[PDB]
Design a protein around this motif. Sequence first.
Motif, PDB file in Angstrom:
ATOM      1  N   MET B  12      37.132  31.891  25.526  1.00 30.78           N
ATOM      2  CA  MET B  12      37.367  31.527  26.917  1.00 30.78           C
ATOM      3  C   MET B  12      38.816  31.089  27.136  1.00 30.78           C
ATOM      4  SD  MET B  12      34.041  29.246  26.342  1.00 30.78           S
ATOM      5  CE  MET B  12      34.704  29.436  24.675  1.00 30.78           C
ATOM      6  N   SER B  13      39.566  31.815  27.963  1.00 27.43           N
ATOM      7  CA  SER B  13      40.903  31.358  28.351  1.00 27.43           C
ATOM      8  C   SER B  13      40.815  30.247  29.400  1.00 27.43           C
ATOM      9  CB  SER B  13      41.783  32.525  28.832  1.00 27.43           C
ATOM     10  OG  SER B  13      41.273  33.108  30.015  1.00 27.43           O
ATOM     11  N   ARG B  14      41.895  29.489  29.528  1.00 29.99           N
ATOM     12  CA  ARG B  14      41.958  28.373  30.462  1.00 29.99           C
ATOM     13  C   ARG B  14      43.419  28.073  30.752  1.00 29.99           C
ATOM     14  NH1 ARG B  14      39.270  24.270  25.966  1.00 29.99           N
ATOM     15  NH2 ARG B  14      40.610  24.933  24.216  1.00 29.99           N
ATOM     16  N   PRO B  20      43.080  29.479  24.455  1.00 25.95           N
ATOM     17  CA  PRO B  20      41.651  29.813  24.569  1.00 25.95           C
ATOM     18  C   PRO B  20      40.770  29.188  23.485  1.00 25.95           C
ATOM     19  CG  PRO B  20      42.969  31.744  24.978  1.00 25.95           C
ATOM     20  CD  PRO B  20      43.934  30.678  24.542  1.00 25.95           C
ATOM     21  N   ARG B  21      39.633  28.645  23.911  1.00 28.92           N
ATOM     22  CA  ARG B  21      38.623  28.113  23.015  1.00 28.92           C
ATOM     23  C   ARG B  21      37.846  29.262  22.396  1.00 28.92           C
ATOM     24  NH1 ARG B  21      32.784  25.632  24.629  1.00 28.92           N
ATOM     25  NH2 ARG B  21      32.341  24.393  22.740  1.00 28.92           N
ATOM     26  N   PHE B  22      37.550  29.134  21.108  1.00 30.69           N
ATOM     27  CA  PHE B  22      36.684  30.083  20.422  1.00 30.69           C
ATOM     28  C   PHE B  22      35.518  29.350  19.790  1.00 30.69           C
ATOM     29  CE2 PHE B  22      35.241  32.068  16.504  1.00 30.69           C
ATOM     30  CZ  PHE B  22      35.059  33.407  16.848  1.00 30.69           C
ATOM     31  N   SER B  38      36.627  25.865  17.891  1.00 35.16           N
ATOM     32  CA  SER B  38      38.065  25.634  17.755  1.00 35.16           C
ATOM     33  C   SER B  38      38.495  24.366  18.477  1.00 35.16           C
ATOM     34  CB  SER B  38      38.881  26.829  18.253  1.00 35.16           C
ATOM     35  OG  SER B  38      38.748  26.995  19.654  1.00 35.16           O
ATOM     36  N   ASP B  39      37.637  23.859  19.362  1.00 30.32           N
ATOM     37  CA  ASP B  39      37.947  22.619  20.083  1.00 30.32           C
ATOM     38  C   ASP B  39      37.504  21.361  19.347  1.00 30.32           C
ATOM     39  OD1 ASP B  39      39.413  23.581  22.231  1.00 30.32           O
ATOM     40  OD2 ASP B  39      37.794  23.370  23.692  1.00 30.32           O
ATOM     41  N   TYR B  74      41.312  36.521  18.904  1.00 33.92           N
ATOM     42  CA  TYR B  74      40.682  36.594  20.227  1.00 33.92           C
ATOM     43  C   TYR B  74      41.606  36.117  21.330  1.00 33.92           C
ATOM     44  CZ  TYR B  74      36.098  38.445  19.248  1.00 33.92           C
ATOM     45  OH  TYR B  74      35.069  39.269  18.887  1.00 33.92           O
ATOM     46  N   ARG B  75      42.587  35.305  20.962  1.00 36.39           N
ATOM     47  CA  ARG B  75      43.592  34.885  21.924  1.00 36.39           C
ATOM     48  C   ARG B  75      44.509  36.050  22.245  1.00 36.39           C
ATOM     49  NH1 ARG B  75      44.678  28.730  19.619  1.00 36.39           N
ATOM     50  NH2 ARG B  75      42.585  27.982  20.218  1.00 36.39           N
ATOM     51  N   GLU B  76      44.881  36.806  21.216  1.00 38.35           N
ATOM     52  CA  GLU B  76      45.586  38.068  21.419  1.00 38.35           C
ATOM     53  C   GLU B  76      44.755  39.028  22.288  1.00 38.35           C
ATOM     54  OE1 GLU B  76      46.742  40.003  17.773  1.00 38.35           O
ATOM     55  OE2 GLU B  76      47.505  41.779  18.826  1.00 38.35           O
TER      56      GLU B  76
END
Lengths: 99, 276, 13
Positions: B12-14, B20-22, B38-39, B74-76
């Motif tokens: 999820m991007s923010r 982004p959280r994974f 990841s948070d 996943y951020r990429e």
Amino acid sequence: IQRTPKIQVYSRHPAENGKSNFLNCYVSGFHPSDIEVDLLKNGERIEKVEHSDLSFSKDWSFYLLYYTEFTPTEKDEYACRVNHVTLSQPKIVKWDRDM
Amino acid sequence: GSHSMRYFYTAMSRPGRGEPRFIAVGYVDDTQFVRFDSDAASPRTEPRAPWIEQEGPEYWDRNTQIFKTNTQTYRESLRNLRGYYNQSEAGSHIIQRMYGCDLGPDGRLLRGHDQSAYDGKDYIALNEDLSSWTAADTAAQITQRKWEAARVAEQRRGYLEGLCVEWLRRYLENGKETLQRADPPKTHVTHHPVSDHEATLRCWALGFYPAEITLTWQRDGEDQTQDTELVETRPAGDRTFQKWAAVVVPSGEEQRYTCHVQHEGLPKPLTLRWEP
Amino acid sequence: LPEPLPQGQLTAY
């Protein structure tokens, strides 16, 4: 494109006044994943509430279980309060022991 | 019985609120057994079922590396999909992946699954042949071509027919007392007048595992699909699930209605009536 | 066990 949460409020075990149990609020079918869920006792927010890890169904919609220990009485009223981007204001669903 | 393993990835991007959280969760059937977030204060793979705790440090470190590297990739990917759809940098977006293997009663591979979505819509899916892809739109086609060029399907197939099945079998054996135990529903029928003319009959199924169950009302032996109120199956919090089905009937016709329950834990399919 | 990393570079979408 967004999907609004379904909400169910119920007990882990059949409710018996004066016997410890768990109050559950199951929110599902929603997208995107950000959501706010409170459990209420007599309209007041319950402080110690845990929730399941974020996961999703085969149609990609998200689901979470929120829960907390409680001892039901005849008098005390319980509820789940949910907000989501799809809702204009928080939706309150009351706990009914027969549902 | 038959069994499956699935991992569920959500990225999820923010914009304006960090990277982004994974999050990844892993399941065997309807039992979650691991998570990674990841948070988390200190991101690591954590056990979520007792039968997985026996795995050694090597296993946990291997998982954590896999999820840490995926977090970065996943951020990429979120950046890439933003561009494929010509989207502004302002919005939050979500990529989901769900993948795993299904076994038959004999412990043999039935089929593999590897599907992905973007903002809740099908994006790209590996076909049952575990060799070719189905892309939902011209954006997913860019991903398809990049994955074809990099021979990604062979990687997914090798895992799904190999390590996926091997480890699922391992988990099934280690957690056999629960994973291979079906608990049948405890059932009952309630009755509540809605007026002088009508009454609600509600059929209850409680304490069952796995979640898969069939609850139906019949009138005079005919299914009442359209007139039946059917809540979504819901977790109790102790591993088991709950469900009910309700129908409003003419007062006095109660005995014409039967509730039917099918569940894997049931040695015989149940028929219930209201018992005044 | 989840899908392991490939020997080369994990492929982004």
